[PDB]
């Protein structure tokens, strides 16, 4: 496959190989050495439909550390969908660059970019999913717990793009994934069903977070109103009463539970300060691993 | 000459030399060579007053492939001529960088930048002209037709910055150039006269596109309302009825006619989808050639 | 010390050593050497709260020339203190990059960034101070006058961030510094006192520019502020009558006096055209030296 649009576009063995390579190249960089430059003479255009810190800095810095040059095309720079159609952007950038990263709104825009591009496309977040984040999260789990297989991962909050990529991972690695969400804020039904069809993981959707978290290896949260839906924050506050991850919830989860959050976090909304800053919080190692997982994904896509 | 502001600031032999060099360096990059780095240790500031995908990505990527670093200064980053006088911008950037690219509104802003800069300045599009686009277009014609000399190029649409640079090329290479435009939307009379003064090319301005295109080697179009004039889009849509490039017009043009468009294109306005996507449309090879022509221009200006 | 937040966080010997290195590396780059690349494999995130030409281009170009990659994170890219707390930004970017440069409003935001970052932080301008600008200005003085020690520097204008960093330098190098400001627009009392405490320099605050400038080595001007309340703007205009640096004021200053201005300049407001363009004006060499002083600063912070 040419592109990295969803984790479960790939098989188990391939995903595990990418995660192994992620550890290997991370260790090389951590050693302080800077003479492994496989991307020398290669370029990446990064299309962003909305501003970013983690995705932007991790991709641009990682690509540089492996020898290439990433271009930042911000929202107003190329105005994809206003000034110019996706299919034309894809066909132009494919003639200049070796790979394209895109963070878009409608998922169909990333499918269109992939379909019309002759070079690989990497998904940097859409309204539907966030595969590179979950790949990083899998690496983080491997480093802290030992493995993803057989763990219990409990997401608390909105059934959103992050939950969809957790469901992708649950389609290629066998674990127990729970989404504790308010009624009416479930993840997409087809995405849940596709994970169940894979037959690897125990998948549960529940409205009771206090029961869901018990025995977790990971309690995961995210904002209740995502980029592109910030005008909905107030009604969601009401619907999401009881879904804040606070110290009491982490105590219910138990002593082996780590806290994870893709970031940015809104303290006092989906999570408390005390949770973010607790010893069991691994949000900053988690953020770092965006660069290491993505480096391995790009290596894979470019034939290394 | 220090700068690349207009094609016919240079003589015929120099323009032909730059186009040759464009082919040579293109072949080297297409071969996979990444060890020709003449711009090692050099920097370029790119000043953009306007949106850009082709100009931005072609300049930044090409400069990187030849070993240098291009800085992207977008519309709100330095605000040349508004936050700070152009003469001051020129004199500061000339002390940091080795070359400056600028995309501006008033042509006088680019003249000011060139006049006060000790380093070469490259025009990346003004309200007046767009010489690097037409240099790429000439390379594209050489590759598809064999040569520019003795061809018939028919531009259909607004008498604009693209037409001005076509007229620049017609001042240094002998061919037949027709601009078919609605009454009131003619190119600048002084620019037409300067092309005619050179005595190389047959130059016609007409309001009848259906006659104009007959026997064309190239039918060229562009948006009817350029950047900076988008408040006129509805008025222009009405004034330009009869100037859309559709499949019927390309049939009138004949069997040897290629379709070219600088891009971005607005299907259903100046051109149909069927024309943009036809076998005779070479818009994507055309766009690629921005990088190859500009690479040669920059090499020439920097003494290579 | 990990960070470069204010010049007099460092001792005299260290500041002099940095300025000596600034000359040495400048001379190496001026020779045409591009083989000294101490920042190979290193990255820098640059956080900007507002537009910038000098700080932006000098940091990005300089870091490139010494072998690293600087990322530009503009006002709408991360929103430090607004979309995401400074402590979170610090802890994320510290895991991707080797050094962070920040231009912020509240000084407390730069302190917070330094406190939470495991990597060095460089202050690129706050509401409080601008230490990299004054380090550049010291280098410029050394080159033109021969030394900072024993000179007379007269700043004419608002008691602002630039005055604060002048007072920082006067706390580590013995000279005579005068701030000639409208009554009511004095620099912060504590910053003046801290400079006096160091016991090196003669420090004067006055409201009489025509007397202040007599015998100056440097007459210094700066951006003048625009006002949010329209009667407050008119009152400020009235207060600053007599504080324009014109040819008459430079004549009163005398034959030894150079004119300096951190830029951008607004001719007809703080300074006249005739002064900016005069033979005694060194504003363009001054601007260049932002790159050379900052290169030495970054070298020092990174252990070179
Ligand atoms: N086994 C690879 C060692 C690291 C090497 N010195 C580097 O430059 O990455
Ligand atoms: N930075 C993580 C982004 C994920 C979030 N659900 C969003 O779509 O905003
Ligand atoms: N990308 C090409 C731009 C040319 C057009 N006439 C404009 O000025 O908008
Ligand atoms: N580019 C000048 C920076 C210093 C100025 N006093 C300001 O605060 O804007
Ligand atoms: Na993200
Ligand atoms: Na263009
Ligand atoms: Na109109
Ligand atoms: Na500045």
Residue numbers in the entry:
A (entry chain C), B (entry chain A), C (entry chain B): 72 to 375
What does the paper behind this entry write?
In the AtOTC-ORN complex, we identified additional SO4 2- ion (lithium sulfate was one of the crystallization buffer components) bound in the CP-binding location. The sulfate ion has an almost identical conformation as the phosphate moiety of CP in AtOTC-CP structure. The α-amine group of ORN creates three hydrogen bonds with side chains of N232, D293, and S297. The carboxylic group directly interacts with the N232 side chain and M298 backbone. The ϵ-amine of ORN is hydrogen-bonded with the carbonyl oxygen of L334. In the AtOTC-CP structure, where the ORN binding cleft remains empty, we were not able to trace the conformation of the SMG loop, which naturally participates in ORN binding. This region was fully structured only when ORN occupied the active site. A thorough analysis of the AtOTC-ORN structure showed that two alternative conformations of the α10 region were captured in chains A and B. The conformational changes include the SMG loop and the helix α10, namely residues 294-304. In a relaxed (open) state the loop fragment is straight and sharply turns around G299 to form a 3-turn helix α10, extending from residue K301 to A310. The loop bends, residues 301-303 move out from the helix α10 to form one turn of the 310 helix, and helix α10 significantly shifts its position.
